[PDB]
């Protein structure tokens, strides 16, 4: 009962010699209801085929986000060129008011409580490529204990 | 209950008066450094012993003539 | 791709371009119609649309349009002024709202409802 969504595409079609040339791309995400989320990209000759090549790529294992229980405990660095980025937790009862430009990165696993919209760039490819690499760099509730003792 | 200012001996003209002008210690809400702007400490001197190089302590008394209220106490800092 | 060539005419069709010169106070006004003009040969075949000038301390002279229907828009009248330069017209920079005073405009045109202010037909 896994979860599957897209977020972006290019109009990618140009003048050449010569008439017109065309191509077809995607950027997609997947998730498991036990706090697991993932992403990737595809290309094809056909549009619903550039979605499939993407979503088969997003199915790679899906990172377990530190979610205890309806919210999360630390804003991980989504480091990028100038995006910046930092999420803002909310106190376990109020909803996923985050950037619909990328929100499917947190929505596909069910996560009820987190916000922040897209603080330094209104291009999804930028706040996507940033978010997933902060989510792999995280720490469990159990790790931060060791980080501050033994 | 005297206010005791830190007066540097900076000017003399008259026989039984001097001016010991330092910075005005009544602050306002500004940047984050000291209150560095002067005030006109006319002192009724009588003994001249603080001369030229000292730091005096001064106290609140009657302006018997134009703005010259203060009187002397002692040497806070010795002649240089 | 070459900006001092591109900037003029790319792709938009409402466009910004307008030129709206002077200010001195506000652009709306009362408009002493100062003198009435009926002339100036052009390719837009501009009959009956009798523009006027306006004595306003602005630094240079200024002129204003008939706004809409109503033949007797007379040069002694002092109806109201607003901005909006229709592409039909050189020299002008504002159009009237000409319904006050003795001016009429809207004689019997039932469709005006709130647009200019009219009462209902035999409904």
């Amino acid at each position: 009962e896994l979860q599957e969504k897209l977020i972006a595409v290019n109009r990618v079609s140009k003048t050449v010699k010569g008439g017109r040339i065309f191509s077809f791309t995607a950027l997609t995400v997947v998730g498991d209801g036990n706090g697991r989320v993932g992403f990737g990209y595809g290309k094809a000759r056909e549009v619903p085929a550039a979605i499939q090549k993407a979503m088969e790529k997003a199915r790679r294992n899906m990172i377990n986000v530190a979610l205890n229980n309806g919210t999360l405990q630390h804003p991980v660095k989504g480091v990028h060129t100038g995006s910046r980025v930092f999420m803002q937790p909310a106190s376990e009862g109020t909803g996923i008011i985050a950037g619909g430009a990328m929100r499917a990165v947190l929505e596909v696993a069910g996560v009820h409580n987190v916000l922040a919209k897209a603080y330094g760039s209104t291009n999804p490819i930028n706040v996507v490529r940033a978010t997933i690499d902060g989510l792999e760099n995280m720490n469990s509730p159990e790790m931060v204990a060791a980080k501050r003792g033994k | 209950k005297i206010r005791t200012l830190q007066g540097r001996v900076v000017s003399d003209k008259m026989e039984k008066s001097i001016v010991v002008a330092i910075e005005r210690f009544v602050k306002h809400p500004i940047y984050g450094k000291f209150i560095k702007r002067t005030t006109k400490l006319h002192v009724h001197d009588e003994n001249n012993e603080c001369g030229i190089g000292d730091v005096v302590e001064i106290r609140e008394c009657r302006p018997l003539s134009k703005t010259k209220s203060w009187t002397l106490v002692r040497v806070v800092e010795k002649a240089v | 791709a070459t900006v001092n060539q591109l900037v003029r005419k790319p792709r938009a069709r409402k466009v910004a371009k307008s030129n709206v010169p002077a200010l001195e106070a506000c652009p709306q006004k009362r408009g002493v119609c100062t003198r009435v003009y009926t002339t100036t040969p052009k390719k837009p075949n501009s009959a009956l649309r009798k523009v006027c000038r306006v004595r306003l301390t602005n630094g240079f002279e200024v002129t204003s349009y008939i706004g809409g229907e109503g033949h007797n828009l007379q040069e002694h009248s002092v109806i109201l002024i607003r901005g909006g330069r229709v592409k039909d017209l050189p020299g002008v920079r504002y159009h009237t709202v000409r319904g006050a005073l003795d001016c009429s405009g809207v004689k019997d045109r039932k469709q005006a409802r709130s647009k200019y202010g009219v009462k209902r037909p035999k409904a």
Partner: protein, 129 residues
């Protein structure tokens, strides 16, 4: 580093604890082995050694978990001449309530958390977490 006494502590330890080292060494100073005393109690380090008691030095044992710094998110805000002072009710509350920061008040250096429990105000040395 004499333009900003004691800042070269926090900089040198964040380079230190990224640079794959178990260790980072310097001379001691009026407030730095104080900061070391908090970190060993807050266990964000393994240990420190005050070495050479007649005129000592300052040696910290860095917590090289995963080969990334335990302090990678730190921020030294307060700076020379232009201090930053905050009441008992203004004091930091950081990462949604997980904590921590380090302050200076009338009872030493301590954390935000320790300064709150005391009922104190003070200088804002570093948001740690």
């Amino acid at each position: 580093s004499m333009q900003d006494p004691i800042a070269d502590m926090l900089t040198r330890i964040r380079n230190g604890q990224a640079a794959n080292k178990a260790a980072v060494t310097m001379p001691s100073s009026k407030l730095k082995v104080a900061i070391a005393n908090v970190l060993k109690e807050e266990g964000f380090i393994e240990d420190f050694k005050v070495e050479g008691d007649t005129k000592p030095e300052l040696e910290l044992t860095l917590k090289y978990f995963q080969g990334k710094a335990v302090v990678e998110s730190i921020q030294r805000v307060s700076r020379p001449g232009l201090r930053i002072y905050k009441r008992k009710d203004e004091l930091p509350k950081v990462m949604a309530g997980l904590g921590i920061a380090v302050v200076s008040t009338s009872k030493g250096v301590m954390t935000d958390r320790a300064a709150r429990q005391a009922g104190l105000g003070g200088e804002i040395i570093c948001y740690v977490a």
